[PDB]
Design a protein around this nucleic acid. Structure first.
Ligand code: AMP
Length: 639
DNA sequence: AATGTCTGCCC
DNA sequence: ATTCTGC
DNA sequence: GCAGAATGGGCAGACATT
């Protein structure tokens, strides 16, 4: 009966009925166009609550009509390929994608490239493209082609990905090509990501319980509730799903349990366990110690060195298997044979399993001192052998999430940290507890902040010990504070840099400039040397003003005294004129930027770590910008 | 063999 | 990673 | 304050090209 064309699917309508308002039939694969139309409706709105309801409508229809497609539809909505620990990646960026578009349309790659840049969205290019009879795309078919792309490996694999991609585009109808392309480029731009997908899912399976006989007698379990009881109930079901997901961020595990046992019984089937990465506790920036004392009020807190390495979530399973996961739940085990072989040394004989929250820091065993993050990044990644490791690592342990088969997630940090100290064993330069200070005295805190930089850290992490001090990400994901010198007004490295070029903006930046190429003044050669790009720190209004004043400085070709070497050629070369104050966290030795090359190193120039716009220096012309010699001086002052 | 470009993921 | 902003 | 979307530098690895 339901022969509604998916082109008319409207998951945003009032009084959405999961069966009758779907654009597909019970037992039919969810059409990809149904997902694209949901994306369109989500795009058109800015209230996340409207977005969540719209997605929820789609999901309720999937649960009611096509339950096996729930997982692909969710992954499509998250724009992921599977669980984060499986390390599946498309291996497709704008390069492979635009080359695929060019072939599907007959156009030259430069033309497509130029249009994508101007429109700021590869989706608009693929959609408005003449594709110089295939069945309609389904959600699971598209999902599975994405996974086919990601699995393609070896010589000629790029051509094989382009072929799959072209096959997708030739079957696309209406808005499908826009979202296929946006999916492949990695930016859906819905205004809706993981938190809203979770809210939509918990809402969907609460209103339309999975697993009923068809047609479901219970299509809207909110209908018997007052508005206020409905809100309270959806919030509680949502919290169940979110807290479970933060401990087990694996839809492949969660969805079957959801579909079979329902959401209220989810915690009984999915729990934190070693070997499945969990979502890490994150930190909010603070702009000074006073801000720390106020945000925390009367809560006792501790300060810890903020080490400059990579987060390493170390799992030791019952039975001895050791896994190491990144901050993003990627499996880094194969990267760290040195750490696996040192686990025996770090725990008492009674420790049978754990999840440790640590920072892996590059460590010079000769000098017994910390090495910079840049050195850490020269470690091999895949399938590393333990004897060939050149850059040793020292683990700085700061949290214990799971111990001897018990979750510590609801334990306050005071207790988790005590359990860390009591059950684990320090070895200098191999595994040590984060340097810490428990105080509320500004003097000691300021001094400790100073000491951490002198001890080659970035600053401090500040964490309450007992008040709201648990590790429950679903309750507050940014429960910690980070205090870095470069956050403090007038403390960090600031530079005055010449804007030499602009890059057309993507997404909401389309039609203006999203980034800028900046240069220092090389006094000796009287040239401007590219030092970094810049794309954060301006309000939207400033960004519109920058575009409006700088488009008048656009040059057809660059000045001959403007050296950019390996930096990305700007979309618009700009007459050097505008001078901007830029803050950064650090200077780095750069493989591409020419700024100050030969003043520290004969071949490498210098770039900025985490540059951000502070303000225009309308009082300066290019010759008053920070010089390359000063950039070198700053770099050496880092020691 | 060597080099250059693209990508994913660290921050 | 930093930063901005509509809700 | 959340959640999301803009955006930064730079590495190893995987390919492509020569
Ligand atoms: O938000 P940021 O990504 O800048 O910082 C969080 C990040 O810092 C790392 N870290 C180092 N030392 C730490 C620590 N986190 C928590 N406690 C201590 N002592 C860690 O990798 C975080 O992800």
């Amino acid at each position: 009966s339901n022969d509604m064309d998916p082109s008319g699917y409207n998951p945003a309508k009032n009084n959405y009925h999961p069966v009758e308002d779907a654009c597909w039939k019970p037992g039919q694969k969810v059409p990809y166009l149904a997902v694209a139309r949901t994306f369109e409706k989500i795009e058109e709105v800015s209230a996340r609550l409207r977005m969540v309801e719209t997605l929820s409508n789609l999901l309720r229809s999937v649960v009611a009509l096509s339950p096996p497609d729930l997982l692909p539809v969710l992954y499509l909505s998250l724009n992921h390929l599977g669980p984060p620990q499986q390390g599946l990646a498309l291996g497709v960026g704008d390069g492979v994608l635009l080359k695929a578009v060019a072939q599907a349309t007959g156009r030259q790659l430069e033309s497509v490239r130029a249009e994508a840049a101007e429109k700021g969205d590869v989706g608009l290019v693929a959609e408005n493209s003449r594709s110089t009879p295939p069945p309609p795309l389904t959600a699971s078919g598209v999902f599975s082609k994405f996974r086919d792309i990601a699995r393609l490996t070896g010589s000629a694999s790029t051509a094989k990905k382009i072929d799959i991609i072209k096959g997708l585009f030739v079957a696309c109808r209406h808005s499908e090509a826009r979202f296929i392309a946006r999916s492949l480029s990695g930016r859906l731009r819905l205004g809706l990501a993981e938190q809203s997908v979770l809210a939509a899912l918990s809402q969907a399976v609460s209103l339309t319980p999975p697993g009923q006989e068809f047609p479901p007698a219970m299509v809207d379990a909110g209908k018997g509730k007052t508005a206020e009881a409905r809100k309270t109930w959806l919030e509680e079901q949502g919290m169940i799903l979110k807290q479970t997901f933060c401990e087990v961020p694996d839809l492949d595990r969660i969805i079957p349990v959801l579909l079979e046992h329902g959401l209220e019984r989810l915690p009984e089937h999915c729990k934190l366990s070693p070997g499945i990465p969990l979502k890490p506790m994150l930190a909010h920036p603070t702009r000074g110690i006073s801000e720390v004392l106020k945000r925390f009020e009367e809560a006792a807190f501790t300060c810890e060195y903020k080490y400059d390495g990579q987060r390493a979530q170390i799992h030791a399973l019952e039975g001895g298997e050791v896994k190491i996961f990144s901050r993003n739940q990627a499996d880094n085990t194969g990267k760290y044979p040195d750490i696996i072989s040192r686990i025996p040394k770090i725990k008492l004989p009674s420790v049978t399993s754990f999840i440790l929250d640590t920072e892996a820091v590059a460590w010079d065993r000769e000098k017994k001192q910390i090495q910079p993050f840049q050195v850490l990044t020269t470690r091999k990644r895949k399938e590393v052998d333990a004897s060939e490791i050149q850059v040793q690592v020292c683990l700085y342990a700061f949290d214990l999430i799971y111990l001897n088969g018990e979750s510590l997630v609801r334990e306050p940090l005071s207790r988790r940290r005590q359990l860390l100290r009591e059950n684990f064993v320090e070895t200098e330069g191999e595994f040590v507890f984060a340097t810490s200070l428990d105080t509320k005295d500004i003097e000691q805190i300021a001094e400790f902040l100073e000491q951490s930089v002198k001890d080659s850290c970035e600053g401090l992490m500040v964490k309450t010990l007992d008040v709201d001090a648990t590790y429950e990400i679903a309750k507050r994901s940014h429960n910690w504070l980070k205090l870095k010198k470069d956050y403090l007004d007038g403390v960090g490295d600031t530079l005055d840099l010449v804007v030499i070029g602009a890059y057309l903006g993507r997404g909401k930046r389309a039609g203006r400039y999203g980034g800028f190429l900046l240069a220092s003044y090389d006094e000796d050669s009287e040239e401007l040397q590219a030092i970094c790009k810049l794309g954060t720190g301006f309000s939207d209004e400033e960004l519109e003003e920058h575009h409006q004043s700088l488009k008048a400085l656009v040059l057809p070709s660059p000045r001959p005294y403007v050296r950019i070497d390996g930096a990305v050629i700007p979309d618009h070369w700009l007459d050097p004129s505008a001078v901007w104050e830029v803050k950064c966290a650090d200077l780095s030795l750069s493989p591409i930027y020419p700024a100050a090359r030969g003043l520290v190193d004969s071949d490498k120039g210098i770039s900025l770590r985490f540059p951000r716009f502070i303000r225009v220096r309308e009082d300066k012309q290019p010759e008053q910008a920070t010089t390359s010699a000063q950039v070198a001086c700053l770099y050496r002052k880092q020691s």
